[PDB]
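Sample 3 of the quickstart, ligand guanosine-5'-triphosphate:
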Amino acid sequence: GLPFLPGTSFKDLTKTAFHRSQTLGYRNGYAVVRRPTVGIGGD
Amino acid sequence: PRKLYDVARNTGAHTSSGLATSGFRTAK
Amino acid sequence: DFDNAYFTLLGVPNKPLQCLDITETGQRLRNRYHEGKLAPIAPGINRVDWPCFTRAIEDWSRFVSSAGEFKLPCASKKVESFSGYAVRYLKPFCLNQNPSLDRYGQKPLPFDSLNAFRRFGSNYSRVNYLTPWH
Amino acid sequence: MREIVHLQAGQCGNQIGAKFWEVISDEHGIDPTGTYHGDSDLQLERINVYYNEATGGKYVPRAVLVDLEPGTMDSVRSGPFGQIFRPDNFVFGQSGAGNNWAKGHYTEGAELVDSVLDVVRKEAESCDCLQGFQLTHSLGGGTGSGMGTLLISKIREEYPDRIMNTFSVVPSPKVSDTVVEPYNATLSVHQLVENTDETYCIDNEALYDICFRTLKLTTPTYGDLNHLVSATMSGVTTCLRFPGQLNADLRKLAVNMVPFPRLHFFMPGFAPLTSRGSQQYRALTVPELTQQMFDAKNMMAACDPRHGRYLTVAAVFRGRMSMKEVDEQMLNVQNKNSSYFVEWIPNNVKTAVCDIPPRGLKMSATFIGNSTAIQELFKRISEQFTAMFRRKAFLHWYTGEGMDEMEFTEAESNMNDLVSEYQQYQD
Amino acid sequence: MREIVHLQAGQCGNQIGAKFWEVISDEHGIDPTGTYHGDSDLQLERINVYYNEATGGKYVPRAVLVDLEPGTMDSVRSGPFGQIFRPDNFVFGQSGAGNNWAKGHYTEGAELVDSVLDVVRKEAESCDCLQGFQLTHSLGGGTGSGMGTLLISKIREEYPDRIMNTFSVVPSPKVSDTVVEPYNATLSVHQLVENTDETYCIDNEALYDICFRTLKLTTPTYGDLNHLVSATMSGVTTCLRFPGQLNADLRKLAVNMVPFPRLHFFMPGFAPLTSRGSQQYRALTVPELTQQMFDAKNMMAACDPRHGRYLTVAAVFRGRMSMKEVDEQMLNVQNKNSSYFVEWIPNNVKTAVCDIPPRGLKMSATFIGNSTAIQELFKRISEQFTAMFRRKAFLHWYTGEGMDEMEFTEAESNMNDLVSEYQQYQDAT
Amino acid sequence: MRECISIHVGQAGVQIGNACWELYCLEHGIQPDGQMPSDKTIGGGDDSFNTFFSETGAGKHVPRAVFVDLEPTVVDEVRTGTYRQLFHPEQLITGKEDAANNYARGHYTIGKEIVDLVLDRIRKLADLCTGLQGFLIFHSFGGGTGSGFASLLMERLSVDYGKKSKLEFAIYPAPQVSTAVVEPYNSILTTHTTLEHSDCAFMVDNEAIYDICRRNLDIERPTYTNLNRLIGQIVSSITASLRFDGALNVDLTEFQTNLVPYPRIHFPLATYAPVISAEKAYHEQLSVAEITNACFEPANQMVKCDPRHGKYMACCMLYRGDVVPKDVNAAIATIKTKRTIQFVDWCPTGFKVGINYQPPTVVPGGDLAKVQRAVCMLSNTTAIAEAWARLDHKLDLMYAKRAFVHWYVGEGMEEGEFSEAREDLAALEKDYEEVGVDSVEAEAE
Amino acid sequence: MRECISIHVGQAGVQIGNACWELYCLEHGIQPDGQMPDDSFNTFFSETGAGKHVPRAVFVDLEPTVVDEVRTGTYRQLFHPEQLITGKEDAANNYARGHYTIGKEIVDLVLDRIRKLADLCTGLQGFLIFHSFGGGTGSGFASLLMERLSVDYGKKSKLEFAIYPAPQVSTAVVEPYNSILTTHTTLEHSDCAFMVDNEAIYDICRRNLDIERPTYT
Amino acid sequence: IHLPRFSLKQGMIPRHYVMPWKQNMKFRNVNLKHAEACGIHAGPLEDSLFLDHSERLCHGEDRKVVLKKGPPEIKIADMPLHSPLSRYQSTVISHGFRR
Amino acid sequence: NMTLGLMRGTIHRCTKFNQEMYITRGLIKGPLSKSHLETREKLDRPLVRM
Amino acid sequence: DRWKGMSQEQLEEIRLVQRQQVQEKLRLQEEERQRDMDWDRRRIQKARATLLFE
Ligand SMILES: Nc1nc2c(ncn2[C@@H]2O[C@H](COP(=O)(O)OP(=O)(O)OP(=O)(O)O)[C@@H](O)[C@H]2O)c(=O)[nH]1
Ligand SMILES: Nc1nc2c(ncn2[C@@H]2O[C@H](COP(=O)(O)OP(=O)(O)OP(=O)(O)O)[C@@H](O)[C@H]2O)c(=O)[nH]1
Ligand SMILES: Nc1nc2c(ncn2[C@@H]2O[C@H](COP(=O)(O)OP(=O)(O)O)[C@@H](O)[C@H]2O)c(=O)[nH]1
Ligand SMILES: Nc1nc2c(ncn2[C@@H]2O[C@H](COP(=O)(O)OP(=O)(O)O)[C@@H](O)[C@H]2O)c(=O)[nH]1
Ligand SMILES: [Mg+2]
Ligand SMILES: [Mg+2]
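Result:
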């Protein structure tokens, strides 16, 4: 909950999986957009 | 004692006091 | 200076008018804070930080200034003393903030390591033979 | 009241706008769901500059997200603040431009410019009084450098008398990222010269120098660089959304900092940047902010002010300060360094002061500097362009989409003319 | 406010200045964290002379630390008093000068002057009314000699009206540490007469002499010599920091002491010096203080003033005292040995009195004296130089950096002109 | 019977009014709700508020002011501040987009769509007044709506209300300190309005009030609020005779009678005499001679000019508080002796006095001490030309290479405005030096 | 109506005027804070209508270390906060400095306060200037101050109480230059000049008074 | 046609000073006849020799007899040690040193 | 730089001549605040009126 | 027409108001000192937490 200043962003060091999920997509020529039920890495 | 410094504030020959030591105080 | 036993009214000490020195406002390095105190928590408004200032302090400061500095009249005296209810909110585990944090950080680096991306202060450049920045 | 329709095109534009909207939502007090969880009344008084009132007591951003390939939109949608953007604003194609300006401007951007113009025509006409547009993109990529300039060329026809800003990332001196980057840079500068009212040039190793020397960051990700660009991006419009003793919008800065209509390439800055272990060794105070404002180790473009003459300088302040101290500091800096300011303008500093500082900070400031030292960047890009174009190095990847070489010749002629015209005011 | 910007330079400069900042923080009651804990209110109103204002009531010293290797920087930073200094003020390089005047002045040291200049301009524009600068270095080194002189000759023309003091440590005649040191000594002395206003000549074996006979110190490490230097380093600027019956700043000791713009080499001294065994067997009075100041065993340069003539004598007294038994004693010392004072100045004495003594001492006094007996240091450095240069002993370590070989010749010529100018002004009637 | 309608244009006008109307609400017994708890006044005749206030049907007092700005970021502070219920909601006009430091925008593009509503509100305010003495315009020269829209407002007011008096308290660009770059263009182009459509124009330098605040008061680092309090005190002193009782009352027409020698010379200088803190009022007294001599010092002046090099053509002294006319007469007889204050030859008297018995009112959290006496010298001097001489140089330097004119000509302004305004200011310089030359002979031999 | 404005220039002037005003406050009824615990005080003290008496003096010095003790110690309440005029640097034992370079930007403030003191004066008998010849501001700024005081007020008598340089003892080296150069100017702008010497007072204090070891007080 | 023709405004000149021979009721007619013989002025209208810190310069003695009056100017050589001008010897000494 | 060196005496002498001439110009005119003028200096005087 | 001037008690009231203003100036100086100390302590707290995380 520290204040958001340009020196307080950090990396998640204990993170192994980095898979993305195609939330954007096409079904029948229509630009479909679905809700993200999962983050980056399967979380 | 803070009670002493409030009773002794208005002691004198021509001084009117309303505070009372150990009891009810006057309505004025 | 607001504490005096002989000027106690209704259980609260008050400051008389004869103890105010006119030269005290032009004294920057006499009434000053030296060390202060840290807290091992996140920043914010809390109950253990001493000079913590909420939005209820500035309203009180504007109110007291518009209340005529809390005068106390007396018999045969128009204004005798100054009420102690106007300076209560400037009156008061925790660690010291002044011990240096750079001693537990990284070592200082030489100047050419610091010049890894854009070069500053090179003798063989244009800007070394121009008037510097003051 | 005064409404900014934020546009972003490309991977750089999307990854900068993600942190930009994070910073704005932190400053206006918006939770990731979209509602308001702040603790002040001033955070809601001018919230329609960046947000839309909608169903739920919640505020959605006015963001138009554009990319030719949805590869990097996947990361921002999976971020902590990816659920605020409306799903209709995501405009995306099927194939990327491949760092080619011609694919992002003639072949693949042409099929996508219809839906983007529909989205911005909807977002721009849901406004009581639209102030102007805002574009974040890059001059090295393919869909940024082509698609964003196509968007500007199509929007300035529809809305000619409005304010266009461009927080472009201009190419970097020492190490590049794209081999064919000088071609894209020249072809995009040729459009931004005639198309943009206010351009902001940001270099990447300038930010690397900031993060390494000023902030002493051992392991900086791109999140910190985007945080710095977002911090100087929100400081330009901070008087539109918050009160102050002296207010200045985008149009006031456009009037004051642009003498002639072809000098609008500014060098941004952010004043209270201090390392972690050097935090308690210095104080936040107006001289010690305006000194770092004018320092050469604080500019976000990789060219020091000493290479040329300062033409006009902005300074937008935030916090509880005295006006006499500010207006004596900006006079003192002009008096001391009399050789680096133009003599034919008696005052080269425009000053505005806001009320609310950023969270956790006493004072903040945003340096915006129009200088004649930015002409040495355009000379560098122009000579790299001539080295590439003399032997027609990568030109078959551009003529293969149906481009004439006279485009390259004219894009370098415009750059050369602007370089020669910046040199006119050096004396 | 009249604030001094302190400039350390090299290993000698850093080892002296660490102790100097220690005694300054002792006098003003500053802890190593940087706060104030003094027992009196007289130690705070004139703290802006040496201490800048940081956040939270923290006082940071007005020092820039300069070195060409990170060996001494890292030692002084890890010392007990190393955490007061600003982290950005540590500017050092990778490759040292290697006891070369030319590396420190032309090739390696020129790389670093543009960052020390940045820190100095950073620090001097924050001054309201800047009084002057202060440099500590040694003339027998490579970055104390070359880089320090480049700093001297580069901050003088930017600020051409301030007061510049150098607490230089010129090479000793007898004890030696560096073979190549006559070259550096000559090439720095030739440059020290154009861009300085006050220069304080200090010999290491003179301080050894003080420790071995006056102080009766038996194993004097470098810290004791640093305290001996720093006590008179703080005894000159003492009137700015404390009130007194008769105040004198650096400039008041500059106008009153140098008669001509090329005679600014003095021999410092410190009056109440005694052993620990003789602590209680002494009455700290003015006749016991002036008698030790003018003693020939007290000066920190190994040049006996009995071989020359005192051009001007300055004395700064500290501690509560009056002004009869000061002036009567200085009259007595002017009249007793009148053969050692020049007759073409009738009153050769400058006197200032401050009434805030150092802690643990009732009274103290600092001697600054301009004498023409300083020519025997210059001529003997020149003799050791010309016993080396005629055979071109180490000239390839200097010629190989682009320095023209005539520079040694003009440095020797200017040194000889200094010696002859001091000689003419001695017997002048 | 003695009403006065205040018009505050621009950011500077609104923030000046935010202190002026607090001072007015404190001089009379007006709570920020709009109430008068006690009808009796300690120095007036139960209608003294009629100059600034008007009654409603609910026992309420409403100011006779119109706040105009082309942006709402400073007017909504009034709409949400402590005095939110004091002002009529219609009395605070606002626009959509400001002129953005452009005289052309506020004079030709943005100001045309809002001037009718402001003139409507001015008409409905002047309908209620039966004894309207004049107007008081508050604006600044270095702005777009303080210089462009104020010019249009005065141009329409002069042709609407005839020869009714009007006064402006403008803010002039300082010689060295400025907050805008394009400021000399706006300050030059607005000279024709304050010369043509005016009766007595006041020029105020922010820098001079900065020296007054730092030197006379113990306030280092002041803000715009401490600057606005002094201007509020001055406008209170210039109108105190239309409200309160005094020995020698002076209205706003006797002002222009005894101050304005020629219709093209209406630029006097303002100074407030006992501007001291409560620290330094403890030692010195505030006698009439002390605060009459202190008004003539160049440091006490509220512009950056030196009155010693010029010659006074007229002088108007307004006195407040413990002032009996004998003391004013003694002070004037004292200041006629000295060589420094040199008057013009065609004004042997050169003094107009006015005495009011009310001491000036202090505000909570204020800067000035509470005093027994107050003087406000309002005098015209030939030494005011050294501000126009400093402004003409900056305009000539900018326009000689035609720097910022593209933001102006494309916004509807014909580009010949700058040359004509420069020629007007040159003619003013020549006219101001024509009335200062002694009509005497320079001896012989 | 018999008032006498005192001017104290330099360290010698301030350290003389401290004892002078201590004696003046004791001689009349004036408390150290300017109050009363019979018109003899009007020559030296002014009147405010609240019981406060303000001295008719100016303490002018270029170095701040001498005057700052006055506005800190016992009699800090007595003097007006502005009447203690103070510069940034000093003249540094240089008549040329305090007369041409540093003393020029200070003389306007001293002249303005002298004018404001004389505005309170209706029967101004004359001035009393205390300085010393051997200093820089006591010789440079004192000469310039009297030199423009003569043009400011004319034939009004200005009395001098100057510390002449002693024959045998001296505190400086450059003082013959200052003492030569200021008597070239204190001849046409000084109606009288009472001269004192430090070593003669030392001998007086040693012999007549019992006090050996005497300070400047 | 004729207007008052004053001089440069200086200090040390009274705001209003009339010659005392015009306001003397005893010895009046002899003064008027003397003024008529000298041809200075007998009328009452412009009767102020010093007005508005300046000299009248109009109704006087033809402005050349007035200037050519009194002893001639003295050579600046040296003041004797009794003259009141002996305080200003220090400037005459410097002016003699200058040449 | 030698041409720079020799100029300083002439500039300083011009400044001093200007200062002395300003002061004698101020001495020709009377003192400020004519109430300080003694009775032997007014042009009116007792001697000149008779 | 015939007002002599303010009596003694009015001037005494003006003096009392001046004394009140002096007291208020003292209080506000203490106010600004505590504000500055507060925000210094805030900045140092944030820096220390960041150092711990590093
Ligand atoms: N004394 C004083 N001057 C002010 C104040 N506010 C603004 N100013 C002056 O006004 C100028 C700022 O421009 P303004 O004229 O206020 O701008 P504006 O009237 O709102 O016109 P636009 O900004 O174009 O809408 C600055 O140069 C200030 O000197 C104030 O509160 N007090
Ligand atoms: N009698 C007497 N003489 C004093 C006193 N204080 C200083 N002096 C004289 O002053 C001389 C020293 O020079 P100062 O007068 O202090 O110099 P200054 O007036 O401060 O001007 P600067 O030289 O620029 O500092 C000594 O020779 C003393 O004779 C004092 O208290 N009493
Ligand atoms: N400074 C900075 N540059 C970026 C960032 N993201 C992408 N870039 C730049 O983007 C360029 C690469 O092209 P890119 O924009 O990814 O291709 P595009 O998406 O097809 O337009 C390079 O010049 C990088 O400098 C960022 O977060 N910060
Ligand atoms: N007198 C004295 N000399 C020192 C001290 N520290 C180092 N030196 C001398 O410095 C001389 C060489 O200086 P050096 O370290 O080479 O300077 P550098 O160029 O900075 O490395 C030697 O003769 C040492 O005796 C000290 O504390 N006191
Ligand atoms: Mg505005
Ligand atoms: Mg002194």
